[PDB]
Amino acid sequence: GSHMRSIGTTKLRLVEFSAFLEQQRDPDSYNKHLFVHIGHPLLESVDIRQIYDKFPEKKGGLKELFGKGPQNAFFLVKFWADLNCNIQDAFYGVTSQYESSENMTVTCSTKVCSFGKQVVEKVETEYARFENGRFVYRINRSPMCEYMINFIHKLKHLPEKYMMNSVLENFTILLVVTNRDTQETLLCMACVFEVSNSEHGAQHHIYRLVKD
Amino acid sequence: GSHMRSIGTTKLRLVEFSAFLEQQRDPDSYNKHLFVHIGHPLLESVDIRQIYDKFPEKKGGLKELFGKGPQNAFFLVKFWADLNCNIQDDAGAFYGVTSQYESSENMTVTCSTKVCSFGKQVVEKVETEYARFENGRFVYRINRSPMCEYMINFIHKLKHLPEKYMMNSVLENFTILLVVTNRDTQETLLCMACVFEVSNSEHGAQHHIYRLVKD
Numbered sequence: 001g002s003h004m005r006s007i008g009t010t011k012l013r014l015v016e017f018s019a020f021l022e023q024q025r026d027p028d029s030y031n032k033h034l035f036v037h038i039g040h041p042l043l044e045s046v047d048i049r050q051i052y053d054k055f056p057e058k059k060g061g062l063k064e065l066f067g068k069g070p071q072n073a074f075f076l077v078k079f080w081a082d083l084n085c086n087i088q089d090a091f092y093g094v095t096s097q098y099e100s101s102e103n104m105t106v107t108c109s110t111k112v113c114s115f116g117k118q119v120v121e122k123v124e125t126e127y128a129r130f131e132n133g134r135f136v137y138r139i140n141r142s143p144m145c146e147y148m149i150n151f152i153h154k155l156k157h158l159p160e161k162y163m164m165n166s167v168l169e170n171f172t173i174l175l176v177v178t179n180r181d182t183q184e185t186l187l188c189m190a191c192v193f194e195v196s197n198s199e200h201g202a203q204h205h206i207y208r209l210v211k212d
Numbered sequence: 213g214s215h216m217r218s219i220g221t222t223k224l225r226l227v228e229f230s231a232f233l234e235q236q237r238d239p240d241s242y243n244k245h246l247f248v249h250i251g252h253p254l255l256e257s258v259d260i261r262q263i264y265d266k267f268p269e270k271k272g273g274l275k276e277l278f279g280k281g282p283q284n285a286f287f288l289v290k291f292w293a294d295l296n297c298n299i300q301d302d303a304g305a306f307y308g309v310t311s312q313y314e315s316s317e318n319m320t321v322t323c324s325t326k327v328c329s330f331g332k333q334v335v336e337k338v339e340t341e342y343a344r345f346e347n348g349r350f351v352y353r354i355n356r357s358p359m360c361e362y363m364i365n366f367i368h369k370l371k372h373l374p375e376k377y378m379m380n381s382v383l384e385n386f387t388i389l390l391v392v393t394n395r396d397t398q399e400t401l402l403c404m405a406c407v408f409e410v411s412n413s414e415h416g417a418q419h420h421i422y423r424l425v426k427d
């Protein structure tokens with residue numbers, strides 16, 4: 001069953017994350033819609049054996065990554081996406097911010113999966129910047145992959161939330177941040193999705209990934 | 213008369229600047245309005261003697277800074293601000309500034325913004341930033357620096373004016389001196405003497421950069 005406890009200490013902390021659509025009305029006016037967001041503790045656990053088939057397995061996959069550890073850097077992130085927006089013609093992007101006490105060069109790998117099979121992998125490397133006593137790794141306007149744009153358009157062409165949930169059930173993202181110089185895994189977020197029913201918009205719940 | 217030519221080599225390059233107001237409609241919906249922007253050549257010149265009275269003078273002032281040089285890092289920036297936006301009061305609004313500078317050197321950079329009313333400093337904002345190595349050069353980015361309270365109330369007062377010619381008249385006595393310095397050496401990397409009017413263009417905010425020269 002669930003095991004609820006603190007993370008402890010990780011070398012890298014995710015502080016902010018957002019996936020958005022920004023549409024220009026005129027050169028001085030921009031409307032932004034957030035699909036999901038984090039950052040705008042005791043954590044429960046999810047057994048990794050409950051999610052193996054939803055993520056790429058075999059060479060370089062989730063079970064192999066988890067076996068190499070450190071296991072306290074592995075999490076399952078549930079998202080409740082906000083698809084309530086009007087798509088017209090626009091920048092689909094992602095923001096993120098990580099922090100660490102160590103100056104590192106980090107590589108972020110985002111793998112988009114369909115039925116547990118990798119369809120896209122985006123790879124971005126970022127050097128550290130010292131700010132207010134720590135090292136910060138911030139990406140301001142990282143473009144979404146083409147697959148995501150078409151997937152969002154597909155979701156919005158469905159009349160009801162239960163239909164969007166059925167499409168989202170087999171869509172996952174595996175986000176892995178690695179120290180480029182040593183190849184150590186700094187953070188791994190296994191992301192699952194559903195549509196948000198809340199009037200407060202997008203929601204999320206983070207769990208620790210455990211094997212027992 | 214104007215002297216029109218290239219800037220030459222500088223240790224720091226301005227790549228982007230904007231002043232904005234961002235308003236939350238709900239936790240997932242935001243609108244952003246740009247008052248001014250840059251980065252979204254042969255430059256003409258302005259006699260620095262024509263602006264001495266509009267900026268801070270004496271110790272640390274424009275004349276002293278220009279004298280110390282490098283003179284090719286000093287510019288007059290004329291802005292035509294876009295004030296066509298709702299004023300958001302008590303509703304989750306952020307009045308801010310973004311900027312991005314780039315260099316081949318790894319430096320610690322300090323940005324000093326002095327707001328002047330009738331040639332006299334009403335606010336000085338000082339912010340220090342470290343470099344990030346990106347795409348083969350050093351990048352100095354500020355994405356969400358808060359505007360000073362003076363600016364927020366001043367923007368609110370301008371917007372209430374019935375005609376653009378009245379906003380231009382108030383703006384004749386408002387200037388901003390932006391000085392970017394290498395924190396460790398005190399060398400002036402960039403100095404922008406900013407003057408303002410309100411835009412009449414259907415394309416929104418506009419700007420023109422001039423090199424400051426002596427004679």
Ligand SMILES: *CCC(=O)N[C@H]1Cc2c(N)cccc2N(c2ccc(C(F)(F)F)cc2)C1
Pocket residue numbers: 019035036079081082083094110112120121122143144145146148151152155173175191193
């Ligand atoms: C190839 C780039 C890409 O797929 N970007 C996505 C990355 C991402 C991450 N890392 C975590 C959570 C969400 C997202 N993104 C995303 C997922 C789902 C939606 C949707 F529910 F609205 F469809 C939008 C965006 C972007």
Ligand SMILES: *CCC(=O)N[C@H]1Cc2c(N)cccc2N(c2ccc(C(F)(F)F)cc2)C1
Pocket residue numbers: 231247248291293294295309325327335337358359360361363366367370388390406408
């Ligand atoms: C104290 C902080 C502050 O005043 N921020 C301003 C900085 C700035 C700079 N450095 C250059 C150009 C414009 C601005 N800012 C600004 C000036 C004028 C307007 C207005 F015309 F709309 F009134 C808005 C913002 C912000």
